[PDB]
Amino acid sequence: GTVQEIMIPAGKAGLVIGKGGETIKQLQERAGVKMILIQDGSQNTNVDKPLRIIGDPYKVQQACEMVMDILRERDQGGFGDRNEYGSRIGGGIDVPVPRHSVGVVIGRSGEMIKKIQNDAGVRIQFKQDDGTGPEKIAHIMGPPDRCEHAARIINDLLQSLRSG
Numbered sequence: 001g002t003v004q005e006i007m008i009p010a011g012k013a014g015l016v017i018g019k020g021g022e023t024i025k026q027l028q029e030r031a032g033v034k035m036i037l038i039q040d041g042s043q044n045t046n047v048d049k050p051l052r053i054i055g056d057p058y059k060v061q062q063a064c065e066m067v068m069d070i071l072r073e074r075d076q077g078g079f080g081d082r083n084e085y086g087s088r089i090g091g092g093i094d095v096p097v098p099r100h101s102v103g104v105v106i107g108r109s110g111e112m113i114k115k116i117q118n119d120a121g122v123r124i125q126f127k128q129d130d131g132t133g134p135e136k137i138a139h140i141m142g143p144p145d146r147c148e149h150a151a152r153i154i155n156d157l158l159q160s161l162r163s164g
Contacts, residue, residue: 026086
């Protein structure tokens with residue numbers, strides 16, 4: 001398959017690997033590609049690590065883009081994977097929403113989720129969710145600022161549902 005390599009310097013470990021694998025999870029799930037990078041402590045433990053993104057061409061394309069961004073390290077957080085698309089919908093943020101909340105986000109016919117698109121000026125894409133079970137990625141398509149603006153509404157809904 002298509003494999004492009006990016007180099008992860010020490011100090012970006014919490015970004016790309018997630019200090020163990022936290023990020024690589026989402027790089028596999030959220031991006032939908034298998035990223036195999038030397039996390040072997042016998043060779044490249046402290047030294048820079050080559051990220052081998054394995055996947056379909058357009059996937060590695062979008063992933064290579066995000067890898068270069070979250071690895072920049074603005075706050076040694078790197079978002080976590082990327083939180084936006086990852087091969088799927090290049091344009092807008094990706095949104096893992098809890099299974100007890102996703103149906104409420106929609107509504108009955110979509111009263112709620114249609115007003116999200118009305119309020120923030122966004123589009124929704126239910127993409128192949130990160131295969132874990134609990135959360136389901138509802139992608140928010142649109143301009144970056146409005147993307148996050150939409151996730152702040154959804155996240156508040158989650159907290160509303162947390163308030164019995």
